[PDB]
Ligand binder design. Structure first.
Ligand SMILES: CN1CCC(NC(=O)c2cc(-c3c(O)cc(O)cc3Oc3ccc([N+](=O)[O-])cc3)on2)CC1
Length: 214
């Protein structure tokens, strides 16, 4: 029998409030969740690109800087993979839920008052837009300085972090959105292409959509 250690963390209170607001309120324009993922991937890819200019060995773990979109209609997941700089364990714990974000309160107030959900990116809390469409999010990540880790949450106020025993990634971050049953349009090729074209046209890294043959 294998033994695996898990650590469970509480979300910072306002982040938990925001997650409940995002999950339990209807919003139109939920398609912007993908813009937010691609934008975060692009930022991570920038980080490794710049780091590699001085230290080409930081690319030992993979030279290609790109984003892959992987819809899976069998398990109702949409996976966004990038070969950006990746996150350490401490980064996941800190950056994905335990540390307050200065934009969370302002954003909840904006939203309450009728701001379009598209505004979320501006408030620095765009990652949480995943919960517009997903009931559960898993973030698997590998930084050159750390082992591969998995973060996961179904909201409800906690997340977990564990060493990832799944398929090794060279470097980068994979976000797996377990979509809500009414949000399966985001597994369709045409819809994904539509929303990438509408919202993610100036990503300066290649993006490839992988479509399972029907
Ligand atoms: C010290 N650490 C600091 C963090 C550095 N890594 C990254 O920035 C990073 C981000 C991602 C990264 C990613 O490649 C895709 C994503 O969809 C989300 C990511 O991380 C984020 C986590 C939180 C937030 N947020 O809430 O604002 C935004 C992005 O992968 N690597 C690595 C060095």
């Amino acid at each position: 029998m294998e033994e695996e250690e898990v650590e469970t963390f509480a979300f910072q209170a306002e982040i938990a409030q925001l997650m409940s607001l995002i999950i339990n309120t209807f919003y139109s324009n939920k398609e912007i969740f993908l813009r937010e993922l691609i934008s975060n991937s692009s930022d991570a890819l920038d980080k490794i690109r710049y780091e590699s200019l001085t230290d080409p060995s930081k690319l030992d773990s993979g030279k290609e800087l790109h984003i892959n979109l992987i819809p899976n209609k069998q398990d109702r997941t949409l996976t966004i993979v990038d070969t950006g700089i990746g996150m350490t364990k401490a980064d996941l714990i800190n950056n994905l839920g335990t540390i307050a974000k200065s934009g969370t309160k302002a954003f909840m107030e904006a939203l309450q008052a009728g701001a379009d959900i598209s505004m979320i990116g501006q408030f620095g809390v765009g990652f949480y837009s995943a919960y517009l469409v997903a009931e559960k999010v898993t973030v698997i990540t590998k930084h050159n300085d750390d082992e591969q880790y998995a973060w996961e949450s179904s909201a409800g106020g906690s997340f977990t972090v564990r060493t990832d025993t799944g398929e090794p990634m060279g470097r980068g971050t994979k976000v797996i959105l377990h979509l809500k049953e009414d949000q399966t349009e985001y597994l369709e090729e045409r819809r994904i292409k539509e929303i990438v074209k509408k919202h993610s046209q100036f990503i300066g890294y290649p993006i490839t959509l992988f479509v399972e043959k029907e």
